[PDB]
């Protein structure tokens, strides 16, 4: 029934329940990439040590994502969908990253300074130390591959230089600038190292995922990886709830997983990761 599904898709709506009051300030207009794309105020990231007196000051277009599909007693991982490579917000990004003690970044997008800077670089160059707001970041090397590079950067506060920190930026440079990759393998491998990594740093912060405007690529990237740990944590012979999963994600930041395509790359990436995980196991 047309209405049986409409009054079903209605309860799936939360944008009306959750307020996006902070991203709406005429003070954060430039702090945004898409006027329609904004972070829920509740699960949104608040730049810290700022000044309440300054209209727009502690705002960043990002949110805290959490897999509510796994238990707190089940060491599930932490992410941060977010907007990305916006020149007009690079120090906001490093304050977000610094204050959230994040060690691994997951840029699901290349550079697109197009004429100006749709997507601009927020790192230096190998052996290059750059300052960003109160923090200085140095590039210790990009360990590329055919699809995703990997720059080793150490971020330290201009105040404390002996307080060195190395964050792992896993940029993905093979995503269809106008679609979804024809193969999960890459990101499926991309997610592999990222996971093993974060897991290497005993007490690191959430995983800062993002693209231009952390929504489509960012949403897909989170749900696939999220789904990977449910299996990795619960099992292959466990029930997967992609639809229920993607929603749980949306209800945390609007826009996560925007198109139909990204909707399939997940069915592909998870049907593959599964049959390949059991293949390895020689699951007959």
């Amino acid at each position: 029934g047309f209405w049986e599904e409409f009054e079903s898709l209605q309860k799936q709506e939360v944008k009306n329940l959750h307020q996006r009051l902070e991203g709406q300030r005429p003070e954060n207009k430039g702090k945004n990439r898409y006027k329609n794309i904004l972070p829920f105020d509740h699960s949104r990231v608040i730049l810290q040590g700022r000044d309440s007196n300054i209209p727009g000051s502690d705002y960043i277009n990002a949110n805290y994502i959490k897999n509510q599909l796994l238990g707190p007693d089940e060491n599930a991982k932490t992410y941060i969908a977010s907007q990305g490579c916006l020149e007009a917000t690079v120090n906001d990004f490093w304050q977000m990253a610094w204050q959230e003690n994040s060690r691994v970044i997951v840029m699901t997008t290349r550079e697109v300074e197009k004429g100006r800077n749709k997507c601009v670089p927020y790192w230096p160059e190998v052996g290059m130390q750059r300052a960003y707001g109160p923090y200085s970041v140095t590039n210790c090397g990009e360990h590329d591959t055919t699809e995703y590079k990997l720059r080793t950067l150490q971020v330290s506060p201009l105040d404390n230089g002996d307080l060195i920190r190395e964050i792992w930026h896993y940029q993905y440079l093979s995503w269809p600038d106008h679609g979804v990759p024809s193969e999960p393998g890459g990101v499926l491998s991309f997610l592999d190292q990222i996971n093993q990594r974060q897991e290497s740093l005993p007490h690191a912060g959430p995983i800062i995922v993002h693209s231009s405007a952390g929504i489509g690529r960012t949403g897909t990237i989170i749900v696939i990886d999220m789904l990977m740990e449910n299996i990795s944590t619960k099992g292959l012979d466990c029930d997967i709830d992609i639809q229920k999963t993607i929603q749980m994600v949306r209800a945390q930041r609007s826009g996560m997983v925007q198109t139909e395509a990204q909707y399939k790359f997940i069915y592909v990436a998870i049907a593959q990761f599964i049959e390949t995980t059991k293949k390895k196991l020689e699951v007959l």
Binding site: K15, G30, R33, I37, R116, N117, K118, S212, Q258
Partner: peptide, 10 residues
């Protein structure tokens, strides 16, 4: 003029 396009959500 920092142009663009994109967004839609939930």
């Amino acid at each position: 003029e920092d142009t663009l396009t994109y967004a839609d959500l939930d």
